[PDB]
Design a protein around this ligand. Structure first.
Ligand SMILES: Nc1ncnc2c1ncn2[C@@H]1O[C@H](COP(=O)(O)OP(=O)(O)NP(=O)(O)O)[C@@H](O)[C@H]1O
Ligand SMILES: Nc1ncnc2c1ncn2[C@@H]1O[C@H](COP(=O)(O)OP(=O)(O)NP(=O)(O)O)[C@@H](O)[C@H]1O
Ligand SMILES: [Mg+2]
Ligand SMILES: [Mg+2]
Lengths: 573, 588
């Protein structure tokens, strides 16, 4: 419960709104108790009085009380849910700005060890779980504690030994039953998360490798192992439901003991006098009605275990140290950029094999280089060093004869324009999908670039207001690729890094995109990484990579003139 | 829209419940007993309280009603605990049975159909969506039985005592749904106005969280915080208009809950004083009758209040049912299974006549294929991408169904039992996987009990032992993207070692030593060129050089083997192979 502190300071903001929602939970829940307690006493007072004594008995005041207490538990409950949910959405803005801000400095490298497909889905879920701490834990628990005190103080006027024996019972099961059930379900909840992700890991291996398993006779063997994890996984789910059953049966037995004690103890005497009469039903119906306060407390141990798991999971992700750090030198962006690498060596954080092994190349100003290699040769790991996603361990990288580690992040992002191998289409409009490249560009500047990169159908029937994304219009792989190049054109950085720009495209659009590369960014230092051979004659100083190191380097003519991998690549030897 | 569909989904949900109909019956039966004990415990307090308050009976004379009251409380706690367990065991029983049906369909369909969707998409259907059905059978279905059996028992129990107290409760029975409908009319318009934007704003945080690399390379990280800030105030402002009408509809039940308790107190309280003289049966109104109605007044609406909190479990089970129904109703033609067994372990003879390789969805992947590969001879498939080379290899593996004739030693492949046929089969395909946990368990996938000498001879032959020292734990190091990632050429030599561990009859090589570095390509093709001479072999390669030794070359175009012959004959003679050999190579 020490892991909730970083996220409880985000609840400090909008506390006057969180506190109001808890206050309305007291008022709603005291009116529920007051309505049944007053009704139980009103029935007893009227029956004891009887018909003889109609005029003597003041029945308009209790009848006004039951009317008032009924209105303030329906209106109170309505505004309790409104304020509680409004205050929850206000914090959710704080929990997501906080989570996003901590994940930016470590976006490429801090998240690489995981499966980004199911990690970011888990980060969204964990932020939602942390957002339901007040709704599921704080409000039911704090709301019940204040209600019990008010009931205990209110009943103390009638009788002290009966108020503290009902308030004491309610305060005991508020203070020691949630800790006891959270403590009992701590191991099962951890076993249940371990076994769920183990089943997912074993199922993905069994489905992905179904061709290998089927022919080598291991598919039945590996499904028994998969179905054994499910049995353990379901056993952990059963043990979690045995606590849900046992916690609801113990709340029912405690609330029974409070009813029994009030019937027995208040029968002997309420206050000074024996034969209390109507006051017997005031205590019995208070014990009967006051355990609605403790009803939400019953499940709060299960929710608090989930929030602590999410708080630890988010904290372990956002509290790691960033891979790279940027000096705040505040330099000016150079007009022309010449890139130099010397003995650049890189190993990923946990791997024991080098990804780059002594790569040293030189790119002069206005020069178009093409890095040429197979799959996995480490060419995408080379461009991530230029964008400073990672740091080389035994090499040096220079931009304009000055080390790349001496550039402030604002200057580095304005010096290098990169089109990624995986283009991201944000959910926003087509205008906001291009304004990230250059925020200050006019709507006419964005229009001409789209018409300059061959995206003229995008301007049809909606213009720049077309919503592209999860719910909007999707873009084809070739139509998405021109958007990545459209962004690079808007950025107008001196150095352009293209990772497999013509990848998965038909030769008709591949040639014109590559033609688009040469004519537009002709005065720019261009470093293209690719595994294709088309249009490489345009580039000077073709560089061939293999297994993380350069094996051959020269222009298109020289590489063919001498027998080598490029000549083998072209020939297909 | 699609209401005719949503009714069919709920129709599907009740079909799966037959699996544990026994436990749905016990929960239905225990919810009736749970309502009997609510009346019994309200009757014992009503009779106990009347004796103390009106007759001034000492508590020591009330031991028998107290004992029956304690027992009714203990029994009522046992039923609650028993209903939670019976409800879970019911819901878990559907999930176990359905997950077995889903995996049986996926195993039966085989790798031909599994490769259509990402493995993450299959994990969602098996883990996320099958689990989404639990609360429908564990909580919602038992509660709907409880939401009708209990409130009808309070009305039946109060009616003999007082028909006005029972009419107060029964009077709200048709008024609550009538008012929820009126609010649902207003809430529908607000929901429709805000539906498009809310679903659009739902994925905003995840879409800025994905593609956070792009926000980094452009320096838009700080400018996206103001985007997340603005999309969180817009989401809240839209989702509170929905909630202002949703909590109004939810508060209809809470309005009549207190109006009933208020009317029960006022009616009974005024009845005792003599203000009202209508409700009772002219026998006089007792204090026990008022206590019985007042204790049972909040219990009348409690089952309906829990059903509101379990109602979400129905919408999330219908969505799960939607996808689980489409998965289990697809036609999905699958390869036919026989029971014949191959005679010998000697190299097999493959021969086809008008073969037609068919996709699981019925689409033909390769046209009429006519060929004959004699026993012990290695063939090679060449052709442009999409020609249908892998489809032919998959059909030989039994992963695809074929219309024509495909005979192994004269026995049709459909006649052959898959379990025994795959024992005579080995293969090394493109994008090969390593399902096992470690590097040792992957090489020994074919035979896990092979001794160290058999394993060491396999690693040495495939040149796996040369990159083992680079790995942390040697042979035992776990392999994967999460543990000790192997290079593409290193993981291909593990697939070669795994395939060459056991002597096979037919070896199917699909683009081996493609997208490998120079050293692994030499080592992979060193072991595979030696292993293609010990049995009948079929290799698929885009590299047309150094095919002189291979016994026969098949050229495929649009699912048709158009040119067959040796490398020497096909090279000189103009034809489709000559065009391929002279063709420029588009990519590495
Ligand atoms: N996050 C990572 N952790 C460990 N190893 C990694 C990671 N990312 C990549 N690698 C490995 O680094 C090596 C080079 O990968 P990479 O730089 O992506 O090559 P590439 O030439 O860009 N491949 P491709 O995208 O298919 O064209 C391979 O062994 C990868 O599997
Ligand atoms: N299971 C399948 N369902 C539907 N279409 C398929 C399936 N398998 C293959 N295809 C398609 O059928 C055509 C031939 O595929 P296939 O025979 O696997 O090609 P290939 O010759 O292996 N291609 P390549 O290795 O890239 O040169 C292509 O359109 C494939 O995408
Ligand atoms: Mg790459
Ligand atoms: Mg293929």
């Amino acid at each position: 419960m020490r892991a909730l502190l970083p996220y409880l300071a985000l609840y400090k903001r909008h506390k006057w709104m969180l506190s109001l929602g808890i206050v309305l939970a007291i008022v709603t829940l005291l009116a529920s108790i007051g309505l049944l307690t007053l009704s139980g006493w009103f029935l007893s007072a009227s029956a004891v009085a009887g018909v003889a004594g109609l005029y003597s008995f003041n029945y308009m005041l209790p009848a006004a009380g039951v009317r008032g207490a009924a209105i303030t538990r329906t209106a109170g409950r309505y505004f309790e849910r409104l304020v509680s949910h409004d205050a929850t959405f206000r914090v959710l803005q704080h929990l997501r700005i906080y989570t996003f801000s901590k994940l930016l400095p470590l976006s490429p490298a801090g998240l690489a060890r995981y499966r980004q497909g199911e990690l970011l889905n888990r980060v969204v879920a964990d932020v939602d779980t942390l957002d339901h701490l007040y709704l599921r834990v704080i409000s039911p628990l704090v709301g019940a504690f204040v209600v019990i005190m008010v009931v205990t103080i209110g009943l103390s006027f009638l009788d002290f030994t009966l108020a503290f024996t009902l308030g004491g019972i309610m305060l005991l099961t508020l203070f020691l039953m949630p800790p006891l059930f959270y403590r009992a379900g701590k191991s099962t909840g951890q076993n249940l998360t371990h076994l769920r992700g183990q089943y997912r890991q074993q199922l993905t291996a069994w489905l992905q490798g179904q061709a290998e398993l089927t022919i080598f006779g291991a598919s039945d063997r590996y499904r028994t192992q998969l179905e054994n994890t499910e049995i353990q996984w379901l056993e952990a789910q059963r043990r979690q439901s045995e606590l849900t059953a046992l916690s609801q049966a113990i709340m029912l037995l405690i609330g029974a003991l409070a009813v029994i004690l009030m019937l027995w103890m208040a029968s002997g005497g309420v206050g000074g006098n024996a034969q209390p009469g109507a006051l017997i039903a005031l205590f019995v119906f208070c014990a009967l009605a006051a355990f609605e306060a403790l009803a939400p407390v019953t499940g709060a141990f299960q929710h608090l275990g989930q929030v602590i798991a999410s708080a630890v999971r988010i904290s372990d992700l956002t509290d790691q140290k960033p891979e790279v750090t940027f000096p705040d030198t505040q330099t000016r962006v150079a007009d022309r950029v010449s890139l130099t690498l010397r003995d650049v060596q890189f190993t990923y954080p946990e791997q024991s094999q080098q990804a780059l092994k002594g790569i040293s190349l030189q790119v002069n100003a206005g020069e178009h280089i093409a890095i040429l290699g197979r799959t996995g040769c480490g060419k995408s790991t080379l461009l991530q060093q230029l964008t400073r996603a990672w740091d080389p361990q035994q090499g040096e990288i220079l931009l304009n004869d000055s080390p790349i580690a001496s550039l402030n992040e604002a200057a580095l992002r304005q010096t290098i324009s990169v089109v990624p191998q995986r283009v991201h289409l944000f959910s926003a409009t087509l205008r906001d999908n291009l304004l990230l490249a250059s925020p200050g560009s006019s709507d006419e500047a964005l229009s001409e670039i789209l018409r300059r990169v061959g995206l003229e159908k995008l301007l049809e029937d909606a213009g720049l207001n077309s919503w592209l994304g999860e719910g909007g219009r999707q873009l084809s792989g070739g139509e998405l690729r021109r958007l990545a190049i459209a962004r690079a054109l808007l950025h107008d950085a001196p150095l352009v890094l293209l990772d497999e720009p013509t990848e998965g495209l038909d030769a008709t659009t591949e040639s014109q995109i590559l033609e688009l590369l040469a004519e537009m960014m002709r005065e720019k230092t261009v470093l293209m990484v690719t595994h294709r051979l088309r249009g490489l004659s345009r580039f000077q100083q073709i560089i061939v990579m293999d297994n993380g190191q350069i094996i051959e380097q020269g222009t298109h003519a020289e590489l063919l003139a001498r027998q080598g991998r490029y000549y083998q690549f072209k020939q297909g030897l | 829209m699609n209401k005719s569909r949503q009714k069919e989904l709920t129709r599907w949900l009740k079909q799966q419940s037959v699996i544990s109909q026994r436990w749905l019956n016990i929960s239905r039966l225990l919810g009736f007993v749970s309502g009997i004990l609510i009346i019994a415990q309200a009757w014992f307090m009503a009779r106990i309280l009347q004796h103390m308050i009106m007759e001034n009976i000492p508590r020591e004379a009330l031991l028998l009603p107290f004992t029956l009251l304690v027992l009714t409380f203990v029994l009522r706690a046992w039923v609650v605990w028993l209903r939670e367990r019976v409800g879970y065991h019911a819901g878990q029983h559907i999930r176990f049975a359905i997950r077995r049906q889903v995996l049986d369909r996926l195993q039966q369909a085989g790798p031909a159909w599994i490769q259509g969707k990402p493995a993450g998409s299959w994990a969602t259907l098996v883990l996320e969506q099958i689990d989404d059905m639990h609360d429908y059978y564990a909580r919602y279905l038992p509660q709907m039985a409880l939401a009708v059996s209990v409130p009808l028992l309070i009305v039946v129990a109060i009616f003999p005592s007082n028909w006005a107290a029972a009419l107060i409760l029964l009077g709200t029975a048709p008024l609550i749904p009538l008012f929820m409908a009126l609010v649902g009319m207003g809430a529908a318009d607000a929901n429709r106005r805000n539906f498009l934007a809310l679903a659009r704003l739902s994925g905003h945080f995840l879409d800025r969280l994905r593609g956070m690399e792009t926000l980094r390379i452009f320096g838009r990280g700080e400018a996206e915080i103001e985007s997340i800030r603005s999309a969180s105030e817009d989401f809240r402002q839209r989702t509170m208009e929905v909630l202002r009408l949703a909590f109004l509809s939810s508060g209809i039940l809470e309005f009549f809950t207190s109006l009933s308790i208020a009317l029960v107190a006022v009616y009974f309280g005024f009845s005792y004083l003599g203000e009202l003289d209508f409700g009772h049966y002219d026998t006089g109104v007792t204090l026990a009758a008022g206590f019985l109605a007042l204790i049972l007044a909040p219990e009348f609406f409690q089952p309906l209040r829990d059903l509101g909190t379990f109602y979400h479990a129905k919408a999330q089970a219908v969505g799960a049912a939607d996808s689980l129904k489409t998965f289990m109703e697809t036609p999905l033609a699958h390869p036919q299974r026989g029971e014949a067994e191959l005679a010998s372990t000697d190299p097999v003879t493959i021969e086809a006549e008008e073969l037609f390789i068919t996709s699981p969805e019925g689409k033909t992947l390769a046209g009429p294929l006519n060929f004959t590969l004699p026993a012990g001879q290695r063939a090679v498939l060449v052709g442009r991408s999409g020609s249908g080379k892998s489809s032919l290899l998959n059909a030989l593996s039994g992963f695809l169904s074929y219309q024509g004739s495909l005979r192994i030693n004269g026995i049709e492949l459909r006649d052959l039992s898959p379990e025994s046929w795959r024992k005579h089969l080995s293969w090394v395909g493109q994008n090969p996987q390593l399902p096992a946990a470690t590097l040792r368990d992957n090489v020994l996938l074919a035979r896990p009990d092979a001794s160290e000498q058999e394993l060491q001879a396999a690693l040495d032959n495939a040149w796996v032992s040369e990159f083992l020292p680079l790995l942390p734990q040697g042979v035992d190091t776990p392999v994967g993207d999460q543990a000790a990632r192997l290079s593409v050429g290193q993981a291909q030599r593990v697939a070669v070692a795994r395939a060459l561990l056991n002597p096979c009859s037919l070896l199917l090589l699909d683009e081996p030593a493609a997208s490998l570095d120079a050293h692994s390509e030499q080592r992979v093709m060193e072991a595979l060129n030696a292993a293609s001479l010990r049995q009948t072999t079929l290799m698929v390669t885009h590299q047309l050089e150094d095919l002189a030794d291979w016994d026969v070359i098949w050229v495929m175009q649009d699912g048709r083997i158009i040119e067959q012959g040796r490398y020497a004959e096909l090279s000189v003679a103009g034809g489709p192979f000559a065009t391929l050999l002279a063709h420029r190579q588009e990519e590495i």
